[PDB]
């Protein structure tokens, strides 16, 4: 049923969602999440 | 007439991402409002920045002066059109009225862009169209502007076109291909570095040097790496003033990994603080890292992590989630053990997938046009 | 007309069985 | 009504006129290629 | 919770499982514990000892687990347990995978014929 | 009055090629199917489903069905003048006043071309005469003096079953026209009979209607009536699904090429809801790649919201955002977040999404998802980590994935061996898995073992091309 205005108009997906869930996060960030140990 | 307004892109991004300096944008961009008669830095910053306790009459007397310049434009345009000039007064009003779009909002656009849109008669009367919409499409998050005016320039401006300004189109399209993560087209579109010293579109050539290095650290193959950063010296000296960048590239040619962490973390600090990346730099770092890891895996086969923790630090359980997710990201073709600690390099092409892809196409393709081969029947 | 309604289409079935067999033989000659 | 069934069901089987139509066409084709 | 991996959720459930004579069925539930132990006591395992027959099996030692040591062809090691000496019974299955594939070449090569 | 000339025109173009055209393609034709105006007329049925059909309103009421139902006569060649009688009555809508003679006066009108004369011999004129007026009526189900006339008009279509099994003193092959209609309209049967309640004797209508298309006309009946039976047992509870398990005769020439697609989708839902992962998801895959076009919005979108649920139960599923219509986005707000809860190993999220949208999961109505979806969490975790490390300990995976004890982790390893993912043993003292990955497994003969099926499959498709060459 196409009766409207319209007739002119796991790989890495489930991971593109979790990878778009932590979007500004610290998934990796070694020199940050790894050397906060011996800074103090 | 674009470069302080490209700083306005810099400074609306300064408004956007860094809330550490939650009002730097009103400082140097309201400093850019009291000069240049720019009334935008309290229009959009009235909408997006702070509550504006009192800057009203101090900037509306200059919105009145904006009206005075605007109405001597609105008297110069018809008091100058008495002369028989083909789009010449139209050029006089689109320069200072597209400059009113620089001064003001998209009202300056609709009185500027759509007005000088139709009776474009020459090349600069379309070069300023496409460029002077590429500016505002770049300043905002707009995509139809910066893509489709350049589509017009591919149609209208060229007919083969100038060698120079079409390379300038390659520069703007390279800015979109670094806005989106289009790796081969960013670095490939940044190949010349000849005709782009410092134009009125280029507020910093060294930012262009960052723009080509930040993608030639991904898309560039290793013989292509020595072909660019070693066989080509024309970019070397303007990054010879950036010796940590040059160190990161030669280290990248060497695979020493602690300075990867250092200067890649610095590149990440810039990557936070630079626009056209924020929707995109999540993909960046770890891909960077696997761009290092694979040749690391090309080092040899039965690797231990302590030899890696020499270059990693405490990369023991770091590489647990890191490497286990990189395997789990469909990448990093290997196997890993805890105590016997086998690392694997393999993936011999002439194995299965080269044998696979053709029927991967020719099954949905086969049923697809086979399905098209039955619409003739019933 | 079920007397010879049933029978007559078989008479016009045997022969095209024979040439249905036989076109492969003639094409087999045209290979030669 | 008894054997009023099967003869039209043999007229179903006159696709051999169509498949052997293609074979008769083909006989003409390669026969006249030979000629 | 059975197919989650708790055979002790059985004994937590049987605290209140009468349920208008749901006693025969929980006895057959104990049966479908014990014969699946008769499957899963050494499935891909190295070995077990008596205390694993105290944990997974119950009722310490009947002659039913002694039967389990004497029903399935079992090596009752000295406080030790083995399915066999090899548990897998020497898998090579043909030592010749080639000639039957030449039979695949017989009918398959015939299938390449008769068509074009 | 200027728009009703368009149904005036397209109506006459329908029964021209259809009536005179397909009747002329039905007199002596159709060694298999020379009636191309059958499929053309069905394309005009799709045209009447895209457009308004003829006279649902059309700025008037009830014009064409009192007009064109008369006077065919099938007589001496001045019956093109009867078509001229059909054409020259169009000054009633244009010049005169239009009047109400549908849904109440159709009851003798359906008798009228039969009461003009003993009109003609072939039943597609009769099923045309009880379909092409009456199928414009079935799509106005405002349940007020319109569904009882769908009801009764399809009782006349039950008299088209009666005038289908008892016409041409048996075996003129007009089912290859009429089942071409008796596919579509019979679905409308199970629409309107299920616009109100479940149908229970139309089950039997469907049963004997399946039995009449058994062998004498095994053409377009058995698969479409098979769909009606399948969606009957599907809309109803799960009791009669052993039918195909014992009477697996579900294989026509698969002519309609969408019937076979969504049909294999439907039995995909069947084997899905019984218990199946692999065969279920690969006919989800096969019906998915046999989804025809994007020419109907939503009907792939919601059905594909239901398609990948077994793949949600695999644990290896990607998130459908390129499938996502933004109109489906507001309806996949639980569902985006559902597969978000799938790939996240959280438990409070696992019961929090179920807690949040159990009503939309009732709209799903397939709560076999939740009985094995926690199981799918532990299988995804053990698949990922068992895939990662050769010799992990069970304490490593266990108190990371909150298992709190070694022995239920030994039960996870036990039922993972039983489910056969990895050959992980245990350094059997108290747990503490000793194990392996599996590479250097084999790579050379084993692919060319599969190439027997690749290329025997290829020669299958080869002879599909030779038999495809048998068509002209």
Q: Are F210 and F221 in contact (CB under 8 A)?
A: yes
Neighbours of F337 (CB within 10 A): 16
Nearest to B93 by CA among B80, B107, B106: B80
Query: Least CB-CB distance to F428: which of E3, E46, E97?
Result: E46
Residues of chain F found within 8 Å of residue A17, distances taken between Cβ atoms: 319, 321, 336, 339-340, 343
Residues of chain D found within 8 Å of residue F170, distances taken between Cβ atoms: 1, 4-5
Q: What are the backbone angles phi and psi of residue E76, rounded to the nearest 5°?
A: -75, 95
- With touching defined as 3 or more inter-chain CB pairs under 8 Å, the answer for chains E and D is no
Nearest to B265 by CA among B277, B240, B248, B243: B248
Strands (E), chain B: none
Contact check, Cβ <8 Å, C5/D3: yes
* SS3 state at B321: helix
Nearest to A20 by CA among B276, B283, B176: B283
Contact check, Cβ <8 Å, A32/B265: yes
Chain F residues contacting D, CB < 8 Å?
31-32, 168-173, 216, 470, 472
**HEC string for A1-40:** CCCCCHHHCCCCCHHHHHCCCCCCCCCCCHHHHCCCCCCC
Which residue is closest to B327 within chain F, CA to CA? F388
**Beta-carbon contacts of residue B11 (< 8 Å; ≥ 6 apart):** B24, B25, B28, B29, B32
Q: Residue F231: CA atoms inside 13 Å, Cβ hemisphere, count?
A: 19
* SS3 state at F239: coil
Q: What are the backbone angles phi and psi of residue B206, rounded to the nearest 5°?
A: -70, -30
Neighbours of F69 (CB within 10 A): 22
Euclidean distance between CA atoms A30 and B312, whole angstroms: 8
Query: Least CB-CB distance to A10: which of F295, F316, F344?
Result: F316
Tokens of B67: 């009206």
Q: Is the dihedral of CA F352, F357, F362, F365 positive or negative?
A: negative
Euclidean distance between CA atoms B96 and B80, whole angstroms: 14
A15 CB near a chain F CB, below 8 Å? yes
Euclidean distance between CA atoms F319 and F322, whole angstroms: 9
Euclidean distance between CA atoms F120 and F102, whole angstroms: 25
DSSP summary character for residue E77? E
| CB under 8 A, 24+ apart: contacts of B189-198 | B190/B215, B190/B216, B192/B167, B193/B234, B193/B235, B194/B234, B195/B163, B195/B164, B195/B167, B195/B168, B196/B167, B196/B168, B196/B171
Euclidean distance between CA atoms F421 and F437, whole angstroms: 10
Residues of chain A found within 8 Å of residue B286, distances taken between Cβ atoms: 27-28
Residues of chain D found within 8 Å of residue F466, distances taken between Cβ atoms: none
Beta bridge partners of E80: E77
Euclidean distance between CA atoms F171 and F160, whole angstroms: 16
Residues of chain F found within 8 Å of residue B339, distances taken between Cβ atoms: 391
Query: Least CB-CB distance to D7: which of C5, C23, C30?
Result: C5
* SS3 state at E48: strand
DSSP summary character for residue F389? B
Q: Alpha helices of F278-406 — where are they, by DSSP H?
A: 278-289, 301-305, 309-312, 326-329, 333-343, 348-356, 358-364, 368-371, 373-388, 394-398
Q: Are A10 and F318 in contact (CB under 8 A)?
A: yes
- With touching defined as 3 or more inter-chain CB pairs under 8 Å, the answer for chains C and B is no
* SS3 state at B147: helix
The interaxial angle of helices B318-328 and F373-388, nearest 10 deg, is 110
Element (H, E) at F24: helix F23-24
DSSP summary character for residue E14? G
Euclidean distance between CA atoms E28 and E13, whole angstroms: 14
Nearest to B278 by CA among B167, B133, B178, B363: B178
Q: Are B311 and A30 in contact (CB under 8 A)?
A: no
Contact check, Cβ <8 Å, A11/B268: no
* DSSP string across B102-139: HHS-HHHHHTTTTTTTS---SSHHHHHHHHHHHHHHHH
Euclidean distance between CA atoms F272 and F264, whole angstroms: 12
Contact check, Cβ <8 Å, F456/E112: no
Tokens of F28: 């002596």
B135 CB near a chain A CB, below 8 Å? no
The interaxial angle of helices B124-139 and B3-16, nearest 10 deg, is 20
A16 CB near a chain F CB, below 8 Å? yes
Tokens of F69: 């139902």
Rounded to a whole number of angstroms, the distance from the CA of D7 to the nearest CA of chain C is 6
Q: What angle do CA F70, F73, F77 make, to 5 degrees?
A: 125
For chain B, state the CA radius of gyration.
Answer: 27
Euclidean distance between CA atoms E57 and E11, whole angstroms: 12
* SS3 state at E81: strand
F423 CB near a chain E CB, below 8 Å? yes
* SS3 state at F293: coil
Contact check, Cβ <8 Å, D34/C27: no
Largest CA distance in chain C: 49
**Integer angstrom CA distances of residue B120 from B1, B117, B156:** 20, 6, 10
Which subunits sit against A, judged by 3+ Cβ pairs under 8 A?
B, F
Tokens of F10: 């397209």
Tokens of E86: 């090899």
Q: What angle do CA B286, B288, B289 make, to 5 degrees?
A: 60
Q: Are E97 and E88 in contact (CB under 8 A)?
A: no
* SS3 state at E80: strand
Q: Residue F55: CA atoms inside 13 Å, Cβ hemisphere, count?
A: 24
Tokens of F45: 């049925």
Residues of chain E found within 8 Å of residue F427, distances taken between Cβ atoms: 46
Q: How many CB pairs under 8 A join E and F?
A: 49
Q: Residue E5: CA atoms inside 13 Å, Cβ hemisphere, count?
A: 21
- With touching defined as 3 or more inter-chain CB pairs under 8 Å, the answer for chains F and B is yes
Exposed/middle/buried for F127, CB within 10 Å: 0-12, 13-18, 19+? buried
Euclidean distance between CA atoms B296 and B256, whole angstroms: 10
Euclidean distance between CA atoms B171 and B166, whole angstroms: 9
Q: Is the dihedral of CA B346, B347, B349, B353 positive or negative?
A: positive
Q: Residue A33: CA atoms inside 13 Å, Cβ hemisphere, count?
A: 12
Which residue, chain included where needed, has tokens 């619409």?
B375
Contact check, Cβ <8 Å, F412/E6: no
Q: Are F301 and F328 in contact (CB under 8 A)?
A: yes
Which subunits sit against F, judged by 3+ Cβ pairs under 8 A?
A, B, D, E
Query: Least CB-CB distance to E45: which of F408, F425, F459?
Result: F425
* DSSP string across D1-35: --SSSHHHHHHTTTTHHHHHHHHHHHHHHHHHHH-
Q: What are the backbone angles phi and psi of residue D15, rounded to the nearest 5°?
A: -70, -15
Residues of chain A found within 8 Å of residue B285, distances taken between Cβ atoms: 28-29
């Amino acid at each position: 049923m196409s009766e409207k205005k319209q007739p002119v108009d796991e790989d890495n997906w489930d991971d593109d969602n979790v990878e778009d869930d932590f979007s500004n996060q610290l998934r990796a960030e070694l020199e940050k999440h790894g050397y906060k140990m011996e800074t103090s | 007439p674009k470069n302080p307004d490209l700083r306005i892109a810099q400074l609306r991004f300064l408004l956007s991402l860094p809330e550490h300096r939650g009002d730097a944008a009103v400082r140097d961009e309201l400093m850019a409002a009291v000069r240049d008669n720019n009334m935008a830095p309290y229009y959009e910053a009235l909408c997006k920045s702070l509550d504006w306790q009192i800057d009203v009459d101090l900037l509306n007397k200059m919105k009145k002066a904006n009206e005075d310049e605007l109405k001597r434009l609105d008297e110069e345009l018809e008091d100058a059109e008495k002369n028989l000039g083909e789009s010449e007064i139209r050029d006089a009003m689109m320069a200072k009225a597209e400059y009113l779009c620089r001064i003001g909002d998209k009202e300056g656009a609709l009185t500027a862009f759509r007005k000088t849109y139709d009776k474009t008669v020459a090349l600069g009367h379309r070069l300023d169209i496409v460029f002077y919409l590429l500016r505002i499409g770049l300043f905002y998050m707009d995509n139809d502007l910066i893509t489709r005016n350049t589509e017009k320039a591919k149609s209208l401006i060229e007919e083969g076109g100038d060698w120079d300004r079409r390379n300038r189109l390659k520069v703007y399209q390279g800015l979109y291909c670094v806005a989106i993560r289009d790796f081969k087209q960013a670095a490939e579109l940044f190949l010349d570095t000849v005709s782009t010293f410092t134009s009125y579109e280029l507020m910093d050539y060294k930012t262009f040097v960052t723009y080509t290095v930040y993608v030639s650290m991904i898309a560039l193959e290793r013989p292509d790496l020595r072909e660019k950063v070693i066989k080509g010296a024309e970019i070397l000296e303007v990054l010879h003033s950036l010796p940590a960048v040059r160190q990161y590239l030669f280290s990248l040619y060497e695979c020493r990994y602690s300075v990867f962490f250092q200067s890649l973390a610095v590149v990440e600090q810039e990557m936070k603080k630079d626009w056209l990346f924020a929707p995109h730099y999540r993909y960046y770092v770890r891909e960077m890292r696997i761009h290092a890891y694979s040749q690391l895996l090309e080092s040899y086969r039965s690797l231990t992590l302590g030899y890696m923790a020499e270059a990693f630090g405490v990369g023991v359980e770091f590489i647990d989630q890191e490497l286990s997710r990189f395997i789990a990201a469909g990448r990093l073709h290997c196997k890993i053990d805890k105590v016997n600690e086998i690392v694997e390099t393999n993936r011999p092409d002439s194995k299965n997938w080269q044998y696979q892809e053709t029927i991967k196409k020719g099954d949905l393709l086969l049923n697809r046009v086979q399905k098209l081969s039955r619409v003739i029947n019933m | 007309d079920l007397y010879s309604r049933y029978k007559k289409l078989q008479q016009e079935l045997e022969f095209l069985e024979v040439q249905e067999e036989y076109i492969k033989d003639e094409q087999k000659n045209l290979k030669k | 009504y008894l054997s009023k069934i099967e003869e039209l069901q043999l007229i179903v089987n006159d696709k051999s006129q169509n498949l052997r139509r293609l074979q008769a066409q083909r006989n003409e084709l390669n026969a006249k290629v030979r000629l | 919770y059975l197919m989650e991996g708790s055979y002790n959720k059985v004994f937590l459930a049987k605290g209140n499982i009468p349920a208008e004579s749901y006693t025969f069925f929980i006895d057959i539930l104990l049966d479908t514990i014990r014969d699946e132990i008769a499957g899963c006591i050494e499935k891909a395992y190295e070995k077990i000892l008596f205390t694993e027959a105290t944990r997974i099996l119950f009722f310490n030692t009947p002659k039913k687990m002694t039967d389990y040591a004497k029903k399935r062809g079992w090596v009752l090691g000295p406080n030790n347990y083995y399915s066999f000496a090899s548990q897998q019974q020497k898998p090579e299955d043909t030592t010749i995978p080639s000639t039957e594939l030449a039979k695949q070449v017989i009918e398959y090569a015939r299938q390449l014929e008769m068509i074009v | 009055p200027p728009p009703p000339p368009a149904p005036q025109d397209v109506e006459m173009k329908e029964e021209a090629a259809t009536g005179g055209g397909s009747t002329g393609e039905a007199d002596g034709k159709t060694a298999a199917a020379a009636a191309e105006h059958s499929q053309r007329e069905l394309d005009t049925v799709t045209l009447e489903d895209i457009k308004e059909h003829v006279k649902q309103l059309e700025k008037a009421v009830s014009g064409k069905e009192p007009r064109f139902v008369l006077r065919a006569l099938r007589m001496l060649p001045s019956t093109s003048r009867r078509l001229n009688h059909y054409v020259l009555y169009k000054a009633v809508q244009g010049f005169f006043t239009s009047n109400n003679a549908t849904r109440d006066f159709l009851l003798p009108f359906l008798e009228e071309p039969m009461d003009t004369e003993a009109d003609l011999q072939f039943r597609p004129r009769t099923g045309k005469a009880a379909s092409t007026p009456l199928l414009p009526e079935v799509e106005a189900y405002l349940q007020l003096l319109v569904v009882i006339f769908m009801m009764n008009s399809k009782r006349y279509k039950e008299a088209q079953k009666i005038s289908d099994d008892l016409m041409q003193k048996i075996s003129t092959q007009n089912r290859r026209a009429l089942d071409l209609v008796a596919a579509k309209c019979y679905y409308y049967h199970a629409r309107v009979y299920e616009f109100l309640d479940k149908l229970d004797v139309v089950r039997s209508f469907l049963h004997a209607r399946l039995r009449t298309a058994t062998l004498r006309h095994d053409a377009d009946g058995q698969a479409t009536l098979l769909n009606l039976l399948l969606r009957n047992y599907l809309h109803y509870s799960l009791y009669d699904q052993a039918e195909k398990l014992v009477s697996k005769s579900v294989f026509p020439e698969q002519a309609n090429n969408n019937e076979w697609a969504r049909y294999l989708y439907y039995t995909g839902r069947i084997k899905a809801i019984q218990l199946e992962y692999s065969e279920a998801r690969r006919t989800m895959t096969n019906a998915l790649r046999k989804a025809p076009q994007h020419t109907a919005v939503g009907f792939k979108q919601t059905v594909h919201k239901l398609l990948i649920v077994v793949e949600l139960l695999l644990g290896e599923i990607p998130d459908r955002l390129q499938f996502r219509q933004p109109s489906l986005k507001r309806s996949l707000m639980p569902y985006f977040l559902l597969t978000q809860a799938v790939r996240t190993g959280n438990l409070a999220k696992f019961n929090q999404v179920l807690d949040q949208f159990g009503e939309k999961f009732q709209a799903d109505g397939t709560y076999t998802l939740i009985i094995r979806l926690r199981h799918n969490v532990i299988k995804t975790g053990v698949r990922m980590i068992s895939l990662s490390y050769s010799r992990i300990s069970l304490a490593d995976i266990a108190q990371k994935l909150q298992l709190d004890s070694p022995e239920d982790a030994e039960f996870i390893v036990a039922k993972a061996i039983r489910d056969g993912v990895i050959e992980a043993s245990i350094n059997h003292e108290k747990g503490y898995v000793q194990s392996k990955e599996m590479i250097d497994i084999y790579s050379t003969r084993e692919p060319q073992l599969a190439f027997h099926q690749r290329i025997s499959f290829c020669l299958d498709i080869h002879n599909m091309s030779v038999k495809a060459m048998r068509f002209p």
